Amino acid sequence: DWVIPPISCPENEEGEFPKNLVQIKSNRDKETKVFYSITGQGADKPPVGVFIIERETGWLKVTQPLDREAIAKYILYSHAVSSNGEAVEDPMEIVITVTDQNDNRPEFTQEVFEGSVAEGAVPGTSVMKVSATDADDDVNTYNAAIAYTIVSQDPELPHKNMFTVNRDTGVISVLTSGLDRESYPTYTLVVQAADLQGEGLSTTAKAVITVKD
Amino acid sequence: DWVIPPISCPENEEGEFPKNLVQIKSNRDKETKVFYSITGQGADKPPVGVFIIERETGWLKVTQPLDREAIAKYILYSHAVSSNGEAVEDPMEIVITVTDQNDNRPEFTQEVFEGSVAEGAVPGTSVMKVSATDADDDVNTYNAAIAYTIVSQDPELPHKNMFTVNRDTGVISVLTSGLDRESYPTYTLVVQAADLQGEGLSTTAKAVITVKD
Ligand SMILES: [Ca+2]
Ligand SMILES: [Ca+2]
Ligand SMILES: [Ca+2]
Ligand SMILES: [Ca+2]
Ligand SMILES: [Ca+2]
Ligand SMILES: [Ca+2]
Known part of the structure; x- marks a missing residue:
């Protein structure tokens, strides 16, 4: 009817x-x-x-x-x-x-996320997850469809890109080999969340990764 | 319901x-x-x-x-x-x-209206009618509510205002005494029609009045 x-x-x-x-x-x-x-x-x-x-x-x-x-x-x-x-x-x-x-920008659920990873972990190993929310309408629009990226890594050693993030889930994984606890015991990553599937409003936070034995 | x-x-x-x-x-x-x-x-x-x-x-x-x-x-x-x-x-x-x-201005149904009046007609005597139409909505608005006025009279003799018009109907009547066919055999009046009860869009036309015995 x-x-x-x-x-x-x-x-x-x-x-x-x-x-x-x-x-x-x-x-x-x-x-x-x-x-x-x-x-x-x-x-x-x-x-x-x-x-x-x-x-x-x-x-x-x-x-x-x-x-x-x-x-x-x-x-x-x-x-x-x-x-x-x-x-x-x-x-x-x-x-x-x-x-x-689209008038709400995404917000990470915390300002600093902490994770740890064994130095011998094979590339692909999942380390931690960052997470953001968006108050806009996730049912009927892409105004809350968040894409996660890594903006920077400190230190940039032994390689600039030791990790990678799942664009959809915020799960961070080991991307390449070379992690070495004695040399670089900790990494600070700046991560970004942006709506409209990465093209919209954006916010950042930190992920601090401790390398373990 | x-x-x-x-x-x-x-x-x-x-x-x-x-x-x-x-x-x-x-x-x-x-x-x-x-x-x-x-x-x-x-x-x-x-x-x-x-x-x-x-x-x-x-x-x-x-x-x-x-x-x-x-x-x-x-x-x-x-x-x-x-x-x-x-x-x-x-x-x-x-x-x-x-x-x-209100996007249509009134229009007189002719450019020149003609009428005649006996020189001895008593003040109040109805002489002729001018008429205008308006394409706008006369049922639900004042966009076609027309007010008629006399703008000018030629000659202005023996008095400036020999006639008057009904604001609502456009009927023109003798307003004062003194009409005199030999002296002033004809009058040309410029008449005006304006919507919104006189306050809106406006047009003019002529009324030519022949004075008779
Ligand atoms: Ca809002
Ligand atoms: Ca948003
Ligand atoms: Ca909104
Ligand atoms: Ca129209
Ligand atoms: Ca009108
Ligand atoms: Ca109209």
Whole structure:
């Protein structure tokens, strides 16, 4: 069957407010003068006044930019009251969904990750995992699709690239041979996480790897 | 009962196109992949491509600025077809109404109106009528609500204001005494018509009045 989807409104809208969303209507507006109102969170309950309805025309409007990450869905109820003061409809549920924009940058779950690896570990050996989260919409967009990279390694010995990271999982592995605890007991890697599959907003953190016997 | 009003779109919209109007949906999109299309005048029939629908999301959009005075109402039908090629809904009627903007100036139905009046006619005597039309929406707005005025009179004798016009009807009447055929056999009046009850767009024409015995 054909059905009516929730009203959709993108977050972070700019320009002239308020903005029309949709017109609601009671077909009793034929017999009497009808006045429309809305109730619910976002209307008369917190956050108050985010949405309003024009009492005589039935035009539902949004008055401010929205934030999906604050509230992703609103449930309101419309009311219809004649000029003589009687409700001429049962209140009608109205659903509004807020659509996503890429406005949150990824964040590593810690500033410094620690791991260790045996000096004799064969190339390919998994050492540790770095992890980042992204508040944007991972279900319907790539705004939270994170790619992990290694930005730098200190020291750059015995080779510049002793390790590699899984672009999707943040698991760091031994890339080449030569780890040597006596010479270089510790490595500090700067790792990067970036959304839009690596092309978007980005953040960095450190991974400190202790070489063991 | 609560009912669904036609989609409303203001004429002469500016900025980024296309613009979203509303999202339609088949709840069979649960069982199979659904592809949406629209037919009708404004879609696949002239004017072609004014409205389109995004095949996978169901978002109906308008691609150009509209002109209420060209077309004030569109009737389209939406279709729903599975990826395997069967229609999964009966086509649904979709109505779009175009809302008015004050973009037509009034026009007198002729460039020169002619009338005559007996020189002895008492003040108040109705002489002639000027008439203007306005293509904008006279039902729902004041965009075609015309006010008539007299801009000038030639000659300005025996008095500057021998006549007056009904602001609403354009009927011109004798305002004062002194008309005298031998002295001033003819008057040329410039009359004005302006919408928004006199405050809006305006045009002028002439009224030529012959004084009779
Ligand atoms: Ca946000
Ligand atoms: Ca993001
Ligand atoms: Ca977001
Ligand atoms: Ca127009
Ligand atoms: Ca007009
Ligand atoms: Ca118009």
